[PDB]
């Protein structure tokens, strides 16, 4: 599919107004290419009023007039078709309408005529096509519930009969949805359920797709499904030897070699920030990572020399005290610690006494639900 | 003729609304006439919504083709509109009238009136009546900013409801009071009355609620926090699902303040939920700076939304704050960790010195906070060894508490099967 | 059923962790290599 637009655009302007990178000359520079290639007018506006820049009216008119005149033609064949063609050509004119609008950037008047489009048309394929469009726009400007909406849309046009190419584009953007409303478990789910049919080389590429769907399978999947299904993965592990700093990070957690862990942590931390649809995720995801990691290292063990503990992670002992207080403060991990003689003991629950705590748990919650029923229904 | 269209709609609707008036009055037959006890609840428990319709005309008219038994009394409602239960229903009706319309004078009087014709009527299928004309009455004054007349009112018609053993007034009459008391920040008087009497353990949910969260207020001032906690958490469960916002919203304010004070810290879930984010931010706050242990942000937090907390009434309990802050990061401390050295508690809790470490952290045992010992002949506060709780009669107990509601319930659901013949 | 008129009245689930660091795991890992 076309792309409509570039995310990479979205990938540039976000870099742009993380304010680590606003003075990144080569970023605005390509920004700025990308800007004049495609005539995206009511963008280059939104950008230069958004982000305080002298605006260049010597190319910006020259923009605008060709915005104009290519709109001017677009409309004019649409109205030909209109009074000489049928449906089948007043779709397609009406269909590059919108097109040309979306690539422009003018939100609404490419959500328009989307919508008039769909309006008219019948073909599954085709409905499903603006659908998609509709999708990446709301990708594109990050707008939840123009996402979600089209969202169920395509789900209900799918199951109402389709086809398993655009089952597959779905389940990407259902993917890169999630990543943006922090669903790491459906992310990875839907990421390593289509990794080995990387079909959407407009949303990213296939090394930044591979690249992610590791991260979300990090964070989301248990010690056994990850060797199953992400370290035992032939195109997962295929792309790995092209990315090394991601094989590094990946096979440090899984062989239990944690200070190579934290490095490859941190380089992951600095991308995922610049990054624009992990950009409010950074701080979970290494928060996330760090409890995974310290759970796996004393998963084995049930007193943890805090000094060993220290070297195994490649810091100190006042870091590791000050981060395992954190920890199991929140509640996250199951250890306490003795700093008198610096020792951190492991309070794992057996089995029996979790299943009881389990059993306290749910059936509390189920109590409180009879117990309301039962006093508003008896009187 | 827009307006006259609209208005014909409206009236159409009227006969409509005046249709369900008669189907409640119905109801109310079914009950008193047929004799047969409750119903009134049934014919009642569209009161709000009704009252939402409520319109001048339409009263105008029901005041003219109602009273079948017109005793003349109809004047008293006649002038400034311009049975034995189903009058009481229809006054109580005209004060709601008169309430959405601003004009607490004649309603204070009528509503006086309805007050001594159901003191007469020493009826038993009227007194759920009686406790929603008590109820508005209280309104009524409160719109009025007596609440003072009304504390002996109610008072007295509280030792009549419970003298009749009555279940309905009796809880209505015990609420209002107490949320008299609490208007006027009597919070002596209001112990000892809740302390002396008893609340029916069979009371409507909606009471339970209210008499949930001012016990637990009482609870919460007088520095009894656990079951302070306890009552305000039952009151929320208790609450109704789709309605009551702004109780929902007070229930969750003095739960958050209460549980900061036990050392806690609340739920984020409060502060998502749509419906409260913006009532409940000043104590996101809050509860930031609590956790945190910041006692500049504290400050800030104070000086920048002190009216809120002087309004929804917190303003002590956000001083008696600032003493379980430093008890909140002394129990994070106590709860990551099993042998903590004394000047290592100093810092990490923001202290001066082992002695001062000393003190605070005995004076936290002693109020059961953080449950650990303590050893000053080498300086350290060992916890507790956490025993298997399941080799203790801990499960048993929790499973005791549990199986005999279950068994409470079962008998409660098996009784009520009532059936007609 | 009545409603209590006496009373006047992202997408994340988050859950704390909005604390202020000196990032999350950036220069706190540097400075600790640096130190060690």
């Given at each position: 599919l076309p792309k409509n637009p570039d995310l990479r655009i979205a990938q540039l302007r976000f870099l742009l107004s993380l304010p680590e990178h606003r003075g990144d000359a080569a970023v605005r520079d390509e920004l700025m290419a990308a800007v004049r290639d495609n005539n995206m007018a009511p963008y280059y506006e939104a950008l230069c009023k958004s982000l305080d820049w002298q605006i260049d009216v010597d190319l910006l008119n020259k923009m605008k007039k060709a915005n104009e005149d290519e709109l001017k033609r677009l409309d004019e064949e649409l109205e030909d078709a209109e009074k000489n063609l049928g449906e089948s050509?007043?779709?397609?004119?009406?269909?590059?309408?919108?097109?040309?609008?979306?690539?422009?950037?003018?939100?609404?008047?490419?959500?328009?005529?989307?919508?008039?489009?769909?309006?008219?048309?019948?073909?599954?394929?085709?409905?499903?096509?603006?659908?998609?469009?509709?999708?990446?726009?709301?990708?594109?400007?990050?707008?939840?519930?123009?996402?979600?909406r089209n969202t169920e849309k395509a789900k209900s046009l799918i199951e109402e009969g389709g086809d398993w190419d655009r089952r597959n584009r779905l389940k990407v953007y259902q993917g890169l949805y999630c990543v943006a409303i922090r669903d790491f478990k459906q992310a990875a789910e839907l990421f390593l359920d289509t990794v080995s049919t990387?079909?959407?080389?407009?949303?990213?590429?296939?090394?930044?797709?591979?690249?992610?769907?590791?991260?979300?399978?990090?964070?989301?999947?248990?010690?056994?499904?990850?060797?199953?299904?992400?370290?035992?993965?032939?195109?997962?592990?295929?792309?790995?030897?092209?990315?090394?700093?991601?094989?590094?990070?990946?096979?440090?957690?899984?062989?239990?070699?944690?200070?190579?862990?934290?490095?490859?942590?941190?380089?992951?931390?600095?991308?995922?920030?610049?990054?624009?649809?992990?950009?409010?995720?950074?701080?979970?995801?290494?928060?996330?990572?760090?409890?995974?990691?310290?759970?796996?290292?004393?998963?084995?063990?049930?007193?943890?020399?805090?000094?060993?503990?220290?070297?195994?992670?490649?810091?100190?002992?006042?870091?590791?005290?000050?981060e395992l207080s954190r920890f199991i403060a929140a509640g996250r991990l199951h250890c306490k610690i003795d700093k008198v003689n610096e020792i951190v003991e492991t309070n794992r629950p057996d089995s029996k006494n979790w299943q009881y705590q389990e059993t306290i748990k749910k059936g509390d919650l189920l109590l409180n639900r009879v117990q309301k029923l039962s006093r508003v229904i008896n009187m | 003729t827009a307006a006259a269209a609209a208005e014909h709609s409206q009236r159409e609707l009227d006969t409509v609304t005046l249709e369900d008036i008669k189907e409640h009055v119905k109801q109310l037959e079914k009950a008193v006439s047929g004799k047969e006890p409750r119903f009134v609840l049934r014919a009642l428990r569209m009161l709000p919504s009704t009252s939402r319709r409520l319109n001048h005309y339409v009263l105008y008219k029901a005041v003219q083709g109602f009273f079948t038994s017109n005793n003349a009394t109809r004047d008293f409602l006649l002038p400034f509109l311009e049975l034995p239960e189903v009058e009481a229903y229809l006054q109580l009706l005209v004060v709601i009238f008169m309430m959405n319309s601003k004009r607490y004078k004649e309603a204070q009087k009528i509503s006086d009136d309805l007050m001594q014709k159901i003191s007469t009527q020493n009826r038993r299928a009227l007194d759920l009546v009686a406790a929603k004309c008590y109820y508005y009455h209280a309104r009524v004054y409160e719109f009025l900013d007596k609440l003072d007349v009304v504390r002996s009112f109610l008072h007295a018609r509280l030792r009549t409801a419970t003298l009749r053993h009555d279940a309905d007034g009796q809880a209505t009459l015990l609420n209002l009071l107490l949320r008299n008391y609490l208007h006027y920040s009597l919070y002596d008087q209001a112990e000892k009355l809740v302390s002396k009497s008893v609340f029916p353990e069979q009371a409507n949910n909606n009471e339970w609620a209210r008499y949930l969260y001012y016990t637990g207020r009482i609870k919460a001032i007088q520095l009894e926090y656990s079951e302070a906690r306890r009552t305000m958490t039952n009151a929320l469960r208790k609450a109704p699902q789709h309605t009551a916002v702004g109780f929902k919203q007070t229930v969750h304010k003095l739960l958050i303040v209460v549980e900061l004070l036990l050392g806690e810290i609340p739920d984020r879930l409060q502060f998502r939920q749509p419906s409260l984010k913006r009532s409940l931010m000043p104590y996101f706050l809050l509860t930031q700076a609590v956790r945190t242990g910041n006692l500049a942000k504290f400050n800030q937090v104070l000086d920048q939304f002190g009216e809120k907390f002087q309004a929804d009434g917190t303003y002590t309990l956000i001083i008696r704050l600032r003493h379980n802050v430093i008890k909140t990061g002394v129990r994070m401390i106590s709860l990551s960790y099993s042998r903590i050295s004394l000047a290592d508690?100093?810092?990490?809790?923001?202290?001066?010195?082992?002695?001062?470490?000393?003190?605070?952290?005995?004076?936290?045992?002693?109020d059961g906070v953080i449950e650990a010992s303590i050893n000053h002949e080498k300086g350290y506060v060992q916890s507790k060894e956490m025993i298997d709780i399941y080799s203790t009669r801990e499960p048993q107990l929790a499973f005791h508490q549990r199986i005999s509601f279950c068994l409470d319930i079962h008998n409660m659901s098996v009784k009520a099967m009532r059936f007609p013949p | 059923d009545d409603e209590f008129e006496e009373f006047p009245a992202h997408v994340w689930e988050d859950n704390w962790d909005d604390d202020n660091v000196e990032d999350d795991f950036s220069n706190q890992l540097r400075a600790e290599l640096e130190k060690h």
């Open positions: 050509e007043i779709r397609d004119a009406m269909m590059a309408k919108a097109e040309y609008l979306c690539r422009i950037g003018d939100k609404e008047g490419a959500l328009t005529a989307f919508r008039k489009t769909y309006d008219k048309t019948v073909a599954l394929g085709h409905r499903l096509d603006i659908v998609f469009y509709l999708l990446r726009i709301g990708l594109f400007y990050m707008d939840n519930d123009l996402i979600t990387f079909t959407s080389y407009e949303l990213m590429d296939y090394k930044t797709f591979v690249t992610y769907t590791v991260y979300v399978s990090m964070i989301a999947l248990e010690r056994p499904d990850l060797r199953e299904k992400v370290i035992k993965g032939a195109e997962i592990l295929e792309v790995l030897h092209s990315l090394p700093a991601v094989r590094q990070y990946l096979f440090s957690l899984y062989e239990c070699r944690y200070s190579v862990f934290f490095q490859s942590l941190a380089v992951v931390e600095q991308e995922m920030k610049k990054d624009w649809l992990f950009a409010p995720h950074y701080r979970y995801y290494v928060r996330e990572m760090r409890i995974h990691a310290y759970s796996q290292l004393l998963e084995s063990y049930r007193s943890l020399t805090l000094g060993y503990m220290a070297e195994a992670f490649g810091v100190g002992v006042e870091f590791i005290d000050q | 508690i100093a810092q990490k809790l923001q202290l001066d010195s082992p002695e001062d470490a000393e003190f605070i952290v005995a004076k936290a045992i002693r | -």
